[PDB]
């Protein structure tokens, strides 16, 4: 499993999409960190 | 910018997309106490830039 990044891409033969799984609570911190201002305040 | 505003300047009471950098003032209410143990509050104004 690798990460293809950049141009548009067509998965060739023998390629399938791999899901990346995250530890509990990291996913709630990824999206809040776009503007976590008032949270950072208190 | 999450900034402070209010009477006694509570924090995070204002949101700003720009930084005000011109000559201006903001006022605050400050409660102090003298060496005679008499408590008395103040009203100030801080001209800044």
Curated annotation (Swiss-Prot), chain A:
The chain holds residues 398 to 439 of 893 of the full protein. MVP 3 mediates interaction with PTEN. MVP 4 mediates interaction with PARP4. Induction: Up-regulated by IFNG/IFN-gamma. The gene is MVP. It is found in: Cytoplasm; Nucleus, Nuclear pore complex; Cytoplasm, Perinuclear region. The lineage of its organism: Eukaryota, Metazoa, Chordata, Craniata, Vertebrata. Required for normal vault structure. Vaults are multi-subunit structures that may act as scaffolds for proteins involved in signal transduction. Vaults may also play a role in nucleo-cytoplasmic transport. Down-regulates IFNG-mediated STAT1 signaling and subsequent activation of JAK. Down-regulates SRC activity and signaling through MAP kinases. The vault ribonucleoprotein particle is a huge (400 A x 670 A) cage structure of 12.9 MDa. It consists of a dimer of half-vaults, with each half-vault comprising 39 identical major vault protein (MVP) chains, PARP4 and one or more vault RNAs (vRNAs). Interacts with TEP1. Interacts with PTEN and activated MAPK1. The phosphorylated protein interacts with the SH2 domains of PTPN11 and SRC. Interacts with APEX1. May interact with ZNF540. This is Major vault protein. It comes from the Eukaryota. It comes from Homo sapiens (Human). Present in most normal tissues. Higher expression observed in epithelial cells with secretory and excretory functions, as well as in cells chronically exposed to xenobiotics, such as bronchial cells and cells lining the intestine. Overexpressed in many multidrug-resistant cancer cells. Phosphorylated on Tyr residues after EGF stimulation.
